[PDB]
Amino acid sequence: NADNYKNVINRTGAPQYMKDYDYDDHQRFNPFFDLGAWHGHLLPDGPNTMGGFPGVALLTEEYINFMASNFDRLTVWQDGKKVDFTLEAYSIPGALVQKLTAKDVQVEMTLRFATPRTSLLETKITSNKPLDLVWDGELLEKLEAKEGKPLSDKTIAGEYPDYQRKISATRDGLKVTFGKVRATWDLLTSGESEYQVHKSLPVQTEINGNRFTSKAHINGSTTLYTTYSHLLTAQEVSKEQMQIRDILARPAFYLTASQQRWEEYLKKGLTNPDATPEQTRVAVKAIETLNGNWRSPGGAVKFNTVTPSVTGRWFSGNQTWPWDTWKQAFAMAHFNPDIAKENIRAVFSWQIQPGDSVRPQDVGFVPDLIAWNLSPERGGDGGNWNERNTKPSLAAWSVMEVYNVTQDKTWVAEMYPKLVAYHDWWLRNRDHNGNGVPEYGATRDKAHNTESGEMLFTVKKGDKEETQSGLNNYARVVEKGQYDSLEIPAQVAASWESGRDDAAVFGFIDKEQLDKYVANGGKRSDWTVKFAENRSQDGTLLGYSLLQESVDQASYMYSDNHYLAEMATILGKPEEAKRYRQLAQQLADYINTCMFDPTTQFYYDVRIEDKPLANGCAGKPIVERGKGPEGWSPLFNGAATQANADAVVKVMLDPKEFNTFVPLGTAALTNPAFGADIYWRGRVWVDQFWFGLKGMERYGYRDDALKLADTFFRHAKGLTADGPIQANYNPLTGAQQGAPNFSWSAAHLYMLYNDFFR
Ligand SMILES: OC[C@H]1O[C@@H](O[C@H]2[C@H](O)[C@@H](O)[C@@H](O)O[C@@H]2CO)[C@H](O)[C@@H](O)[C@H]1O
Ligand SMILES: OC[C@H]1O[C@@H](O)[C@H](O)[C@@H](O)[C@@H]1O
Numbered sequence: 001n002a003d004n005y006k007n008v009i010n011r012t013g014a015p016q017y018m019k020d021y022d023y024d025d026h027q028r029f030n031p032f033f034d035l036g037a038w039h040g041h042l043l044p045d046g047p048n049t050m051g052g053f054p055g056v057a058l059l060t061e062e063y064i065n066f067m068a069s070n071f072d073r074l075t076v077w078q079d080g081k082k083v084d085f086t087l088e089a090y091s092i093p094g095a096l097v098q099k100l101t102a103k104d105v106q107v108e109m110t111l112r113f114a115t116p117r118t119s120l121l122e123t124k125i126t127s128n129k130p131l132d133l134v135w136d137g138e139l140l141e142k143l144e145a146k147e148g149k150p151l152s153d154k155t156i157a158g159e160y161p162d163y164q165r166k167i168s169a170t171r172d173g174l175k176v177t178f179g180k181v182r183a184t185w186d187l188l189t190s191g192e193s194e195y196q197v198h199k200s201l202p203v204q205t206e207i208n209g210n211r212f213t214s215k216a217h218i219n220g221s222t223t224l225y226t227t228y229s230h231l232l233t234a235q236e237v238s239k240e241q242m243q244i245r246d247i248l249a250r251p252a253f254y255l256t257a258s259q260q261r262w263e264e265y266l267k268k269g270l271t272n273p274d275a276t277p278e279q280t281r282v283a284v285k286a287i288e289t290l291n292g293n294w295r296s297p298g299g300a301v302k303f304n305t306v307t308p309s310v311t312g313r314w315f316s317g318n319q320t321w322p323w324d325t326w327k328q329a330f331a332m333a334h335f336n337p338d339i340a341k342e343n344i345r346a347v348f349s350w351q352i353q354p355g356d357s358v359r360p361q362d363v364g365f366v367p368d369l370i371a372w373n374l375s376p377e378r379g380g381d382g383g384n385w386n387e388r389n390t391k392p393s394l395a396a397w398s399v400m401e402v403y404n405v406t407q408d409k410t411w412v413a414e415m416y417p418k419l420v421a422y423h424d425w426w427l428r429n430r431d432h433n434g435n436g437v438p439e440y441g442a443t444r445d446k447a448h449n450t451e452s453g454e455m456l457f458t459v460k461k462g463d464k465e466e467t468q469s470g471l472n473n474y475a476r477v478v479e480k481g482q483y484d485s486l487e488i489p490a491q492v493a494a495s496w497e498s499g500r501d502d503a504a505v506f507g508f509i510d511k512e513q514l515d516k517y518v519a520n521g522g523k524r525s526d527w528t529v530k531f532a533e534n535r536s537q538d539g540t541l542l543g544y545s546l547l548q549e550s551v552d553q554a555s556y557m558y559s560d561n562h563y564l565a566e567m568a569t570i571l572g573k574p575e576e577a578k579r580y581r582q583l584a585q586q587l588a589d590y591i592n593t594c595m596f597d598p599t600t601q602f603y604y605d606v607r608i609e610d611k612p613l614a615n616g617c618a619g620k621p622i623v624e625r626g627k628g629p630e631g632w633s634p635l636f637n638g639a640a641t642q643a644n645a646d647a648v649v650k651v652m653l654d655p656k657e658f659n660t661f662v663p664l665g666t667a668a669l670t671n672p673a674f675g676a677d678i679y680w681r682g683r684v685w686v687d688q689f690w691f692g693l694k695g696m697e698r699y700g701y702r703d704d705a706l707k708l709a710d711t712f713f714r715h716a717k718g719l720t721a722d723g724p725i726q727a728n729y730n731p732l733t734g735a736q737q738g739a740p741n742f743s744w745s746a747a748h749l750y751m752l753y754n755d756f757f758r
């Protein structure tokens with residue numbers, strides 16, 4: 001029952017600005033979203049907002065933007081006396097509720113979602129006498145603030161002259177229309193988008209500029225219904241009208257469908273009732289978060305999907321990442337498999353096909369970031385769409401988990417060839433030395449190379465920045481050492497392809513950290529990253545590889561290969577299943593032979609050296625760049641031998657390595673490029689944390705994993721409070737950072753609830 005989990009996240013707030021941002025530019029409030037809808041609602045915070053759900057949050061294609069503070073707020077009049085109500089407002093999973101109580105009149109307002117575009121408000125009025133109902137609303141004026149404090153005195157209309165917001169009135173309520181705004185990083189509307197209000201009774205709505213007042217008279221106790229719809233195109237507007245009429249014709253049907261759908265999420269999802277109440281509350285927060293971040297089909301993304309955070313400054317709209325998705329779907333398989341499936345379909349719906357106009361050399365490539373708007377390269381105007389890189393291979397894992405739950409063979413038959421094609425891309429475009437062990441790298445892309453296909457790089461000495469191109473020129477520069485630093489877009493993308501932006505093993509290290517490394521006897525050239533172009537025998541530039549095979553991706557391709565094998569078996573494709581088992585086995589041999597360092601007792605990426613080693617390995621483990629979470633990837637993925645795993649686990653548990661106040665961060669404390677404030681060189685992310693716990697368990701160390709899980713639960717800050725879930729933690733102090741309502745934190749906090757919280 002949803003009513004046991006009230007106010008799991010604080011969803012109160014009265015937005016005063018379109019961008020009512022917190023310190024890191026995320027909307028500092030947490031609206032309720034559901035059914036994949038494109039608008040959200042907040043609870044009133046007091047007297048000023050009661051009678052309404054303030055802060056209509058709109059998802060304007062790729063961003064979250066508030067529309068109004070008070071919109072369709074009820075005040076009730078009884079024979080010319082304004083009823084002074086007492087307020088009680090709360091959220092539960094799948095609803096907002098507010099109760100207005102006075103002596104003679106009471107109102108109970110219940111807000112759920114009814115469709116992918118429409119929320120449904122039940123306004124249940126109890127009264128002896130007839131009443132006069134007044135609803136009011138007012139569009140926001142001010143643009144931007146941080147922590148409530150204005151960033152400028154700019155207005156919404158000033159900044160977006162074509163936004164030109166107008167309220168109109170309909171034969172059963174009212175609508176806000178919006179002009180076309182193509183503000184790449186802020187606000188994207190089609191010019192046909194609307195916010196529609198329809199009601200089950202006639203109302204008399206008057207409009208004065210950017211506010212309205214609607215009136216109605218009722219003869220006494222009655223239940224009213226209101227729909228709120230953010231409709232983003234004309235096609236959506238037309239298509240939704242019959243939905244709205246069915247909703248208002250049979251509102252009970254939709255309330256019950258929301259009630260039931262949510263009972264089902266909690267029933268399916270809450271499988272560890274022995275968890276502490278606060279742990280259980282964390283799982284519910286996670287479920288609320290993941291479902292809040294679910295977006296129904298929109299623009300270029302023709303499937304339901306889940307973004308990393310609906311309130312996130314760069315994560316909102318339907319902006320979708322692959323490895324985020326794999327993790328999200330894996331978790332969501334257990335309580336909302338329908339959308340788990342969709343999320344995965346959404347990512348693969350933009351897998352590169354033969355004959356692709358932009359990058360035919362990348363067949364099977366899965367884009368890093370898809371969203372409502374295609375990039376200019378594909379005829380859209382989206383600034384977020386990204387095909388510089390993909391993310392790591394956790395896709396078959398995610399698909400198999402959905403299959404584990406649903407036992408739906410049609411799912412496996414649907415996903416198998418997409419997974420095959422993805423596997424095939426890695427081996428074709430990310431395996432420079434042809435040894436079947438992939439590298440991270442970078443696509444042919446305007447961020448990475450010149451039109452003529454020469455790799456870009458920038459040399460910096462003092463205040464001189466010197467932009468250049470060509471791998472051979474890059475090689476000569478690197479050897480000579482006549483620079484302070486280098487910025488290499490293909491290096492950035494390779495690190496983005498691992499998902500661990502700026503991680504040490506990809507050669508990312510601060511000036512002062514590198515100096516100290518060299519002073520301690522290290523060679524500066526130990527951190528130099530090398531690259532090679534991957535060309536088809538016909539000359540075609542397929543992309544760039546770091547001259548480096550990464551242990552995480554090898555390990556992920558390992559398990560991915562096993563899941564392909566199981567799917568092949570399920571689909572009666574015994575030869576293909578054979579091939580994938582043998583490929584897996586080869587990878588495991590290479591992981592253990594090449595990537596394991598028995599001396600430091602850890603796994604590392606290897607260099608592709610100029611000559612392969614005598615054992616066939618492309619190069620030595622890159623021990624000198626330090627230890628990271630990629631070191632237990634072989635364990636999470638089952639590639640490791642027991643002895644290698646035993647060794648890795650001692651390192652994981654070591655306080656001078658990864659056994660920190662919040663343990664298992666993204667670089668060990670001994671990593672020369674460590675920083676507690678650095679996302680992927682020290683901060684603790686819940687995915688990597690959980691992958692380590694799973695790795696440990698798989699090789700017999702579940703008891704130790706439980707204690708790390710307990711330590712994490714006691715130390716990771718804000719976990720038992722009512723704040724939104726964020727992305728990562730300071731390993732030393734446990735302070736939270738990163739986007740609020742962060743999906744894969746929710747996914748993995750949920751899996752921890754399921755797998756490791758006791
Ligand atoms: O754009 C592709 C990359 O996006 C990065 O994510 C955010 C980044 O965290 C944020 O600070 C800002 O730069 O916008 C980006 C989203 O467009 C990912 O971190 C990176 O791995 C790529 O996916
Ligand atoms: O959640 C979306 C993205 O957020 C970034 O901060 C992380 O570095 C990426 O690995 C992730 O894919």
Ligand SMILES: [Ca+2]
Nearest residue numbers: 431433437438
């Ligand atoms: Ca290789």
Ligand SMILES: [Mg+2]
Nearest residue numbers: 272273274275
């Ligand atoms: Mg019990």
